[PDB]
Design a protein around this nucleic acid. Structure first.
Lengths: 27, 95, 41, 97, 108, 96, 48, 81, 94, 105, 80, 97
DNA sequence: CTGGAGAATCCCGGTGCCGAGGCCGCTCAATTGGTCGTAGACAGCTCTAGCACCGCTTAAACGCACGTACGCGCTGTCCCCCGCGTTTTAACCGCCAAGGGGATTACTCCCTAGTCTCCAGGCACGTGTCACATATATACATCCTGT
């Protein structure tokens, strides 16, 4: 589907960014 | 009259009558203005608006009965806006 | 035919809630005034 | 290349009391308003309208949140009112009249 | 044929067992209703009706009125410990409330 | 061309007139008396419905009705309701 | 024995050269749950 | 229509508070009451209209309000017929 | 086999679309299984009562849509209605 | 030949969701697209909740949705917390929050 | 028997810590035990009514889930 | 020696237990209490080992939720500390009274 | 505000256990194909309400003016919960070996319940009105509050 609520889609984007930042530190 | 003597009289008087406490005409326009945002040109049965008023006066009287217990919580006689908010949050309306 | 009172089932005392103390006084008082009362019964 | 034109009318009505009031000395009632020129619902794109009055009033900065936007008030003298119309989209610059 | 006897009468109820069972037969509350469900349901329904009508009338008499108003219902269903529970989340139209004034908000 | 609407007013006045011979009931109070009956009917029937469905059963019964009355009515309220109904089912199956 | 059963995550992750059990009598049962605890010990040699 | 939440006056709120046991009322509580009442009214009215639009009707009957109140856990007696 | 059916095959098919690499524990999968049985009964009961309101003897998709409107908070309802109506639209063309 | 569910572009079971409808004494007539609609809505709520819980757990350096993060996804969403207001997800704990008054300094 | 004291003060303090409480009055443990025994007795009483009706001798988890849904308190994770 | 000020270990307990989703009532004592309560309803009623687990989860959630509403009543009276007065107000408003 | 100790956190990297998923193999159940009543939808049409206006009356909302009473604030006093170390109870094994109490499941079978008729009282909606009690009036009783 990939047709979620805009706030939920933004939360997914923010989660990808949070993971990328977490790995940017941990790596 | 000593502040609180004419107000306690009214507490004893409005807890013994059963008539509505909000004016009809002013409250019926509120129920139509709120309906406005769901359907242009909605009609209301007279008894439907009366039932809405019977719902809301009971809800507000219950909320002002639960808000008084919170006012008496902080050693107050005045009910303060945070009292309505605490009652309602403990109610789950705006948790 | 039927026992012919279950339809009216007047008292049905599962919830009887006795009357007592001051109520007794009321009854007593009532009886007194009735004995003190007049023609109309 | 998209240009949208919305026609509106903004003004004020006033009614003379016939005599100067003893309570506050006011002589006229007045209602200041913005309403649409067309029969359309402004609330679909207007978030709120703020009206800034003369500093004689207890609060000069009034707010209205539903069309036809208007405020009813009383006064005795004429003054300039600043009407600031805010749109639902925060990226759009509000209009000033 | 035989003189027809109703179902409220044979059991000994006032509330309509025929009408009760009837709302049930075409109420989809189940799929194949038996032959005791409406009787029990009507019996208890009307039992609670009597239970309350009692307290309502008694409070009414306390008010020196011969007609039960919705007030004689709010006052009652809030005066009885278990009726209030059963009807705790129920508002009675034109009934009012009970004069419970907090002790701390009184003259001192 | 009539539009007749049903209600419980006829049997709440039989029961009231019998359990209060001198006391009447206003039309507005009988509306409440009607709504109360319909509400409790809904509650007890719904709980019996769920009761039957939990045991994988297609039929709501008077045994399920009694257990739903045990679940619904508070302690005393229950006891009286269960007793009244139970005794009404043995007066009905004895062909009285 | 008795405070190796509730402390075993620490002991299993070690290369023991010798694992020595005194009065190994205490390990009669295969279905003992301390038999399992001691069995899952990395040890090159075992002495009972 | 416009600005009808103001149709709930300061005495109109004070009487309702008197019936609830409240003795002394604050200044801001009138606006809090207006907000709370507005939210409750909007929810009940919305749910009632859900039964009218689905029913293809143009008038909101009493049964719609009764059912909307029931869904909100506010069973009301007196409008059942 | 049969015995005890559940949602597990659809809670994992739908989870592999949102997050292709994320799994689900048996306890959490059970929780999802339970959660769907909640919403199904809620929507279906409100739809049965809705059919009873307009005195129909059938639960159509209109009843289900109005029952979805009565339970979901705005955005949730506005997207669930779109999901249901798109599914019904696409199922009627095949 | 083709499951009724597949003929909607869905992952959920339109077929069994029809049987659960017309077996549970809801009404007397389940339409052609009553289960097609209900199944779609169920799958939608599942998509929402599963996504939230899944990468809430992956926010926790996990690659397996755990019920703790089911609870987190549900309790952080303003719409799913209204829906599941009176539902207690077992083994989900609570949400981290410290009242300012309690907190020091 | 009287084993309502199995819910001990440390346990009530842990339940308060999880609930954000950061200071507990002395008479809060003899309150919480009365509050918890009323909630238990209510949900058990309904779970034993769903068990007697099914003509079963063991209160299964399904009975507890049904009785908890009766109170409004809905719990997810035990087959219902 | 070294000891923390009153309120330092308290917030640490808060943080530790308001992050870790597990039961807090000792298992066996709660299972004994369930049997005590059930003894006065139907004599000799077996409880499935997972029925008591459901009861314990639904009781710990209820008590945690009741403590979250009590801690608000504590802060309503300008009290960082909670006591029977705050639980009572919270349960009063919840409709549990 | 910096210091300086002393405890807590807090990710990194490591090491096995075991749940989560992988596949396989039939059982249940959803699909397919088709006949058979019909749900409700839609096209009128009767006829209540709903709505919309307008006037007269006056309760009532409301603004204002004025103290009094109640509300955030301060500080001091005293105790009762927090922190933390020691004594005590609970509570796991191992040791001891299986019955049996009871859910889980079917196969018969007889009883109950749907289905589907044709009657016949009884429940609704009128109509015909009778009358609780709302509104009005006054003295009696508190029931104050300023002296």
């Amino acid at each position: 589907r990939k047709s979620m609520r805009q706030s939920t889609a933004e939360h997914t984007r923010q989660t990808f960014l949070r993971v990328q930042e977490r790995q940017g530190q941990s790596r | 009259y000593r502040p609180g003597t004419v107000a306690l009289r009214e507490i004893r008087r409005y807890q013994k009558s059963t008539e509505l406490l909000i004016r009809k005409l002013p409250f019926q326009r509120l129920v139509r203005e709120i309906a406005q945002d769901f359907k242009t040109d909605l009609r209301f049965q007279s008894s439907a608006v009366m039932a809405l008023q019977e719902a809301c006066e009971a809800y507000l009287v219950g909320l002002f009965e639960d808000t008084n217990l919170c006012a008496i919580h902080a050693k107050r006689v005045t009910i303060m806006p945070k009292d309505i908010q605490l009652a309602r949050r403990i109610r789950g309306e705006r948790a | 035919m039927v026992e012919k009172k279950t339809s009216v089932r007047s008292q049905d005392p599962g919830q009887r809630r006795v009357l007592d103390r001051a109520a007794r006084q009321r009854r007593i008082n009532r009886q007194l005034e009735a004995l003190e009362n007049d023609n109309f019964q | 290349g998209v240009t949208i034109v919305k026609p509106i009318v903004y003004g004020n009505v006033a009614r003379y009391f016939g005599k100067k009031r003893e309570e506050d000395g006011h002589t006229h009632q007045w209602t200041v308003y913005v309403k649409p020129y067309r029969n359309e619902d402004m609330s679909a794109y207007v978030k709120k309208i703020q009206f800034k009055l003369h500093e004689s009033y207890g609060n000069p900065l009034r707010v209205v949140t539903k069309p036809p936007y208007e405020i009813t008030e009383t006064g005795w003298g004429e003054f300039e009112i600043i009407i600031k119309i805010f749109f639902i989209d925060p990226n759009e610059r509000p209009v000033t009249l | 044929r035989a003189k027809a006897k109703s179902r409220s009468s044979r059991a000994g109820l006032q509330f309509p067992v025929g009408r009760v069972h009837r709302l049930l037969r075409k109420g989809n509350y189940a799929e194949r209703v038996g032959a005791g469900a409406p009787v029990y349901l009507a019996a208890v329904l009307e039992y609670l009706t009597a239970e309350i009508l009692e307290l309502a009338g008694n409070a009414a008499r306390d008010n020196k009125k011969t007609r039960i108003i919705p007030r004689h219902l709010q006052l009652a269903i809030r005066n009885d410990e278990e009726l209030n529970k059963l009807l705790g989340r129920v508002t009675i139209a034109q009934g009012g409330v009970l004069p419970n004034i907090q002790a701390v908000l009184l003259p001192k | 061309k009539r539009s007749r609407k049903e209600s419980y007013s006829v049997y709440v006045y039989k029961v009231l007139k019998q359990v209060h011979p001198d006391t009447g009931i206003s039309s507005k109070a009988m509306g409440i008396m009607n709504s109360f009956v319909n509400d409790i009917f809904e509650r007890i029937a719904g709980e019996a419905s769920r009761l039957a469905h939990y045991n994988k059963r297609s039929t709501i019964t008077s045994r399920e009705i009694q257990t739903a009355v045990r679940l619904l009515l508070p302690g005393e309220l229950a006891k009286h309701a269960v007793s009244e109904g139970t005794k009404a089912v043995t007066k009905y199956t004895s062909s009285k | 024995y008795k405070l190796v059963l509730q402390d075993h995550q620490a002991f299993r992750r070690k290369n023991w050269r010798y694992l020595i059990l005194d009065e190994a009598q205490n390990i009669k049962n295969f279905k003992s749950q301390r038999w399992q605890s001691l069995l899952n010990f990395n040890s090159q040699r075992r002495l009972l | 229509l416009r600005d009808n939440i103001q149709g709930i006056t300061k005495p109109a709120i004070r009487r309702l508070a008197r019936r609830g046991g409240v003795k002394r009322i604050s200044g801001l509580i009138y606006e809090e009451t207006r907000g709370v009442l507005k939210v409750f009214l909007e929810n009940v009215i919305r749910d009632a209209v859900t039964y009218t639009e689905h029913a293809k009707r143009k008038t909101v009957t009493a049964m719609d309000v009764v059912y909307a109140l029931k869904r909100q856990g506010r069973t009301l007696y007196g409008f059942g017929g």
